[PDB]
Design a protein around this ligand. Structure first.
Ligand SMILES: Nc1ncnc2c1ncn2[C@@H]1O[C@H](COP(=O)(O)OP(=O)(O)OP(O)(O)=S)[C@@H](O)[C@H]1O
Length: 696
């Protein structure tokens, strides 16, 4: 009824200036439109006079006002950094990449053929839109859905036959099946792999079920503990044929995650997301059960804690088999309505997830245990043994492994901090920049130093000034390398590891700096490409695929640090360089794990570069010290400190050059620090005393 403009997605050029005004827009562009009373396949490429009179029309103009005009305007400002731009760029991307998800269908809810205004009737569905929500799902024409979304359809019909429905569940009376052991991953888990330590995992949760005991998965974060739940569900269903209704509780941050993981490793499963509190609640009830006013038609549902109260009412009275919960450090508390309402639930079983063993908590120690098993349990010496007893007293219910325990299983790596002097040049630059000041601005001041520390060429007269020796090309490198602490080092670092054929990644904050290496490499004659927000998706894939080319001649590959946070896999490199790092260390690890990507085949060597007695190390010693408190810019406040000395202890220039002069790679590397980035993780709880018996 209310027909016209839901929202405006995009725009472009046509069939043939730089600061445009509305009129330009109006005249040179077609625009993308989700119409109201519609959905995202029904987006059209229209122009002003191709659409005409339509309700809430202004809200289109408003798009130009911001996304063409005032965006394009804003860029001009010379204080807008290059760095700044690529953000604005990666930004468009991110937005329009979300929209691309709304004509990707993920479920189907009702085969219900609709009569049409002829005498004709087509089979129309009822489509759940990915990244979208339960409110706002649309009936759409079968005929073309299917030729777009075969499986989710294929799934649909099966979705009410599926052998694995909930009531075909086998319910163990006096007894319950023998504990067993699976030395190889059972076919019915169809995703891909799972390193032995994965198997071992499921085995454990398994064996435990076949004791009637629930346990806790606390292996250090990012460690597969999702796949390890997913898988272990497949088992409950497909291996103890009981699979009534299952429920996993999740961080809203990561449910988009789980969902993929499911239709990756347990594709055949019928699992249900719980997003929306309003029109969802009501929508879902029309999907969850069977058509009658108590057949639950779904294998697995998933939520945020949120809906465990807004909807404890309905959910409370549901007969549940298995319950897990991710990043559930969240439930140390015994009053928090999670607890009170999760015990308000009917569960045969509990797996629990956290990346942590308890220390302090005595009451937490209780609340967690007393949650998953309602049947458990002075001078400071006496509260110290009690916590220590009840420590071991629950060894059997814990699984905890760390990096080192699965080093055999995984692409090990190695973070080294190579710290260099500043070139005689750099020194003097720094040192002068200092002079000028202390007389939000502090920022560029930081920047100038940051720049100085990386390379003098970032600055304007630099190169011109350096080479007062006229104009030769050998020389152009000669000064280009040697005026820079980092470069000098790096120079023979490549030289050397490019003798060992190490395929090499390099990141920086400063795209300008990238340019400069960009220079370096072409002069030296080395193959590579460059990346960052500037190059459009379309492009990227090609600078990428050429590096990962079956036997490519690219033997290095430049990137923005922010480029990293992308989603881009370059395992074809065995070695990462951080030229310089962020307020945020994670930004560096994102970028790291573009070759630390859990389908890596080498040992990954990671060199973080810092210049000695520079502000640089304060930024990095900051990084760690935050990025230990775990599981994007320095404060103006704190910033005062970080700058306000490092200045006269910054020694000679000609000294520093002397150092650089006959610097030796090896020493630098055998002197190299280590970047310590993990609270001592505690000890490995490698399984339950019992279980262990059954494996050897
Ligand atoms: N066998 C596997 N094959 C391929 N990818 C895997 C495997 N196991 C884990 N992963 C991936 O490793 C990445 C990080 O693992 P996650 O399962 O998200 O970590 P996690 O231990 O669940 O962390 P949480 O949920 O915060 S405690 C994910 O992209 C997983 O899909």
């Amino acid at each position: 009824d209310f027909h016209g403009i839901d929202i405006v997605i995009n725009h472009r050029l046509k069939t043939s200036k730089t600061v445009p005004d509305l009129n330009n827009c109006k005249e040179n562009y077609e625009f993308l439109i989700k119409w109201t009373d519609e959905s995202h396949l029904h987006n059209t490429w229209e122009t002003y006079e191709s659409i005409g009179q339509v309700r809430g029309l202004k809200r289109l103009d408003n798009y130009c006002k911001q996304f063409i005009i005032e965006d394009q305007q804003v860029r001009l400002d010379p204080y807008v950094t290059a760095e700044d731009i690529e953000i604005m760029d990666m930004e468009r991307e991110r937005r329009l990449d979300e929209f691309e998800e709304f004509h990707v269908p993920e479920r189907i809810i009702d085969s219900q053929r609709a009569s049409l205004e002829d005498g004709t009737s087509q089979l129309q569905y009822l489509v759940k839109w990915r990244r979208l929500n339960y409110d706002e799902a649309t009936w759409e024409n079968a005929t073309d859905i299917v030729k777009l979304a075969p499986e989710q359809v294929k799934h649909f019909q099966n979705r009410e036959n599926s052998k694995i429905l909930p009531q075909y569940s086998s319910n163990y009376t006096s007894q319950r099946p023998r504990f067993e052991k699976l030395s190889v991953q059972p076919p019915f888990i169809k995703g891909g792999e799972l390193r032995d330590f994965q198997l071992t995992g499921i085995n454990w949760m398994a064996f435990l079920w076949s004791k009637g005991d629930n346990g806790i998965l606390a292996d250090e974060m990012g460690l597969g503990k999702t796949v390890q739940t997913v898988a272990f569900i497949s088992w409950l269903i497909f291996a103890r044929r009981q699979n009534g209704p299952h429920i996993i509780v999740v961080p809203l941050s990561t449910m988009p995650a789980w969902l993929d993981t499911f239709e990756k490793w347990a594709p055949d499963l019928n699992c249900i997301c719980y997003m929306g509190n309003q029109k969802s609640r009501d929508t879902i009830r029309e999907y969850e059960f069977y058509t009658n006013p108590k057949t639950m038609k779904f294998n697995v549902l998933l939520t945020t804690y949120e809906y465990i109260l807004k909807d404890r009412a309905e959910l409370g009275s549901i007969k549940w088999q298995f319950m897990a919960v991710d990043e559930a450090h969240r439930l140390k508390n015994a009053e928090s309505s999670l607890y009170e309402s999760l015990n308000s639930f009917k569960v045969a079983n509990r797996m629990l997830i956290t990346g942590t063993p308890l220390q302090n908590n005595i009451k937490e120690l209780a609340a967690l245990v007393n949650f998953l098993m309602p049947g458990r349990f002075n001078q400071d010496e006496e509260q110290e043994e009690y916590i220590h007893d009840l420590h071991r007293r629950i060894q059997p219910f814990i699984l905890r492994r760390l990096k080192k325990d699965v080093e055999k299983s995984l692409p090990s790596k190695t973070e080294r901090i190579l710290r260099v002097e500043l070139s005689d040049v750099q020194t003097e630059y720094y040192k002068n920049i200092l002079t000028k000041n202390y007389s939000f601005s502090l920022l560029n001041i930081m920047n100038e130093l940051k720049k100085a520390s990386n390379h003098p060429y970032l600055f304007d007269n630099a190169e011109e000034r350096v080479l007062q020796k006229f104009m030769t090309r050998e020389n152009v490198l000669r000064g280009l390398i040697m005026s820079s602490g980092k470069m000098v080092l790096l120079d023979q670092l490549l030289t050397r590891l490019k003798k060992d054929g190490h395929r090499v990644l390099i990141f920086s904050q400063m795209v300008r700096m990238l340019d400069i290496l960009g220079d370096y490499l072409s002069i030296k004659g080395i193959n590579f490409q460059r990346l960052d927000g500037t190059v459009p998706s379309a492009q990227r894939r090609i600078s990428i695929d050429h590096f990962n080319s079956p036997d490519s001649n690219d033997f290095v590959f430049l990137l923005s640090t922010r480029a990293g946070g992308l989603g881009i896999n370059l395992m074809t490199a065995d070695t990462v360089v951080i030229f310089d790092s962020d307020w945020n260390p994670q930004a560096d690890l994102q970028a790291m794990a573009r070759a630390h990507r859990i389908g890596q085949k080498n040992h990954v060597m990671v060199y973080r570069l810092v210049s000695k007695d520079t502000v640089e190390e304060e930024v990095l010693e900051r990084a760690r010290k935050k990025m230990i408190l775990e599981y994007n810019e320095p404060n103006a406040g704190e910033l005062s400190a970080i700058l306000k000395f490092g200045a006269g202890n910054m020694f000679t220039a000609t000294d520093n050059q002397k150092k650089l002069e006959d610097l030796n790679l090896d020493d630098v590397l055998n002197h190299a620090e280590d970047h310590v980035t993990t609270p001592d993780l505690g000890e490995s709880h490698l399984g339950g005393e019992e279980f262990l018996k059954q494996f050897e």
